[PDB]
């Protein structure tokens, strides 16, 4: 069958360790993936598929679920390492932990503070979905322990703190017994002797070694003969995993821009020679590879990903044309561009405006709010921004400012949105993917693989022309509809059975090239 080996990493030096982030410090770096795009295709068009997880992800159930691949079967390196036997999830309530009798609780709007006899004992934090994610433990206003919880309902891991620094992290089994301990100072991983039955080697120098061990053992002893492996091109070298694949197996190597935009073409040579099939989500990267490596040009193909969590857009069920205007707040504010949008919305009273801000902290949202208030006050009239619903019955306005933290946030916002505007120099990539997926037109300042000029959206020369673009889709129904058509028959030939078909045909075509010598 088909095996997928995703590249689902952390952002630290320990890349095999997924980040643990409280629900509030959460921010949007791209979580949708070429892998997830592909696996979803296999689940409709019901085909057999399995997932091979090499990374430590205590919260992977909610992750898979949120990403619409919860029903996928997976083998997990760290599930073997920790002897997690059942996928049964028990959603933990605080009430059943339990604590000492004297523990009193205080409910921050962000977390829960447990004090015992007045002294700070613990912080209980939550993850984006609301399950207990991790708990910090305190000994005399000093952090000593950090329990990381599994979303299946047990303590997956403990980090120990010396002098307020990470010294050591041991990985429990669901019963609480440590199975391996990892030392986090420059430095190894030790196996608990009681469980030597399950580890060949009694000690490992770097964590990826124990990882590489358990993975390869699965691929050799558990893979049904002549299978197919889709490997997400990991940031560095793919030898780690490619050189673990069966003798008789097809391998597909998959390149996703968000992940592999920066990679030197020279180190790709090894892995690109091995792979039967190559996939890029960017046309010009396909071309970059076809020129530098002309001997393997034939096996590299373009495939555009699409998030199918997005229902098609229900903007026809609205009298008001809603405009989603994206602002990247890592770039500070651009008064000219904010004003050209604000001015368009003032003029056309049949439009509403959501200003979607990403990469922003609480206080930066206020900056966007004040700048909008200011610009409106100095150059326009705020009264022209009062919504029909409110002034045909007489406060509420045609514009508001939303913090886009999730991708889910954006998916909701896009449901009744009629037009997307992004005036950044680098337009939020997930929004482009989400835009074409939901079949909404997009105005950008730079060209892309998701937006085709005068078909899918408008590619502006300067923001001076913003109204010409905006009108093209907001005025009338014809153009906006020729664009839903174009977008739909592009969602079609990139998420059908048709795509896997094209893969099998491309695998046969790669053999017929080998015979030529």
């Amino acid at each position: 069958m088909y095996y997928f080996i995703p590249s689902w990493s952390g952002s630290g030096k320990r890349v095999w360790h997924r980040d643990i982030i409280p629900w509030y410090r959460s921010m949007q770096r791209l979580e949708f993936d070429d892998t997830i795009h592909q696996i979803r295709i296999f689940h409709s068009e019901n085909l057999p598929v399995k997932l091979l997880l090499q990374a430590y992800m205590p919260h992977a159930r909610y992750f898979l679920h949120r990403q619409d691949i919860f029903e996928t079967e997976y083998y997990s390196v760290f599930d073997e390492i920790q002897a997690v036997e059942s996928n049964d999830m028990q959603v933990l309530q605080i009430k059943d932990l339990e604590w000492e009798d004297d523990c009193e609780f205080i409910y921050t709007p962000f977390l829960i503070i447990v004090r015992r006899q007045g002294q700070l004992y613990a912080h209980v934090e939550f993850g984006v979905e609301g399950f207990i994610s991790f708990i910090k433990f305190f000994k005399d206003d000093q952090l000593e322990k950090l329990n990381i919880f599994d979303d299946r309902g047990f303590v997956s891991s403990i980090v120990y703190y010396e002098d307020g620094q990470e010294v050591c992290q041991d990985y429990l089994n669901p019963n609480g017994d440590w199975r391996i301990r990892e030392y986090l100072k420059f430095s190894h991983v030790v196996v608990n002797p009681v469980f030597s039955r399950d580890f060949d080697k009694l000690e490992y120098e770097c964590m990826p070694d124990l990882i590489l061990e358990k993975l390869g053992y699965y691929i050799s002893h558990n893979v049904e003969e002549d299978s197919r492996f889709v490997v997400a091109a990991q940031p560095f070298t793919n030898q780690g995993v490619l050189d673990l694949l069966p003798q008789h197996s097809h391998s597909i190597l998959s390149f996703f821009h968000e992940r592999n935009q920066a990679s030197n073409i020279e180190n790709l040579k090894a892995d690109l020679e091995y792979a039967d099939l190559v996939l890029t989500d960017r046309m010009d990267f396909k071309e970059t590879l076809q020129n530098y490596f002309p001997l393997q040009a034939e096996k590299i193909h373009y495939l555009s990903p699409f998030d199918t969590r997005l229902q098609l857009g229900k903007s026809q069920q609205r009298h008001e044309s809603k405009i989603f205007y994206q602002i990247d707040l890592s770039e500070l504010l651009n008064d000219y561009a904010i004003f050209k949008v604000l001015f368009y919305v003032a003029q056309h009273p049949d439009t509403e405006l959501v200003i979607g801000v990403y990469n922003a902290w609480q206080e930066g949202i206020k900056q966007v709010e004040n700048k909008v208030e200011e610009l409106i006050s100095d150059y326009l009239d705020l009264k022209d921004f009062i919504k029909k619903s409110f002034k045909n019955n007489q406060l509420e306005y045609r514009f508001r400012i939303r913090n886009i933290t999730d991708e889910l946030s954006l998916i909701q916002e896009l449901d009744d949105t009629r037009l997307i505007i992004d005036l950044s120099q680098q337009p939020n990539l997930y929004t482009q993917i989400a835009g074409i997926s939901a079949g909404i037109p997009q105005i950008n300042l730079v060209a892309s693989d998701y937006v085709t000029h005068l078909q899918n959206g408008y590619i502006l020369d300067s923001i001076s022309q913003l109204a010409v673009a905006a009108d093209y889709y907001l005025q009338g129904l014809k153009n906006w509809n020729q664009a839903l058509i174009y977008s739909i028959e592009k969602i079609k030939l990139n998420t059908g059975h048709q795509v896997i078909k094209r893969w099998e045909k491309w695998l046969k075509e790669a053999i017929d090239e080998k015979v030529d010598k």
Binding site: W23, V91, D96, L97, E98, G153, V155, Q311
Partner: protein, 134 residues
């Protein structure tokens, strides 16, 4: 921590907590209204109402089981709602009995179970149980 493992779903304002696994109640609640609600998701991010119900798989089939006794006998109903990703409903099943089998729809992103009400005077509640069936 010890964590207190169990696969049953507990309760978590005459609502008296005589035990983690048993809750008393006296009526205050109109016939047709909700006495209690469990959800597999957060209503909003800040919310101190944390999910109780486990993630389910689409297309699969499950058994929802009440373990409780209602003083006016067959008085408390058991509603089951499936919502999509947009928070719009998908489907809803109500059951007079104490056991129910449903198949988790393929549009469902989350689900809630409520205890509704006929003329309910009092009940003792122990738990809910969900397990996969065929």
């Amino acid at each position: 921590m010890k964590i207190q493992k169990h696969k049953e779903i507990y309760w978590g304002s005459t609502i008296i907590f005589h035990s983690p696994d048993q809750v008393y109640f006296e009526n205050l609640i109109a016939s047709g209204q909700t006495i209690h609600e469990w959800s597999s998701s957060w209503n909003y991010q800040g919310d101190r109402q944390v999910p109780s119900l486990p993630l389910l798989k689409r297309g699969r089939s499950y058994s929802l089981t009440r373990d409780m006794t209602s003083y006016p006998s067959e008085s408390v109903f058991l509603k089951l709602i499936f919502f999509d990703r947009y928070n719009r409903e998908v489907s809803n099943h109500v059951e007079r009995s104490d056991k129910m089998t449903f198949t988790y729809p393929e549009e469902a992103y989350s689900y809630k179970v409520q205890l509704l009400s006929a003329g309910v005077e009092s009940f003792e509640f122990h738990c809910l149980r969900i397990e996969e069936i065929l």
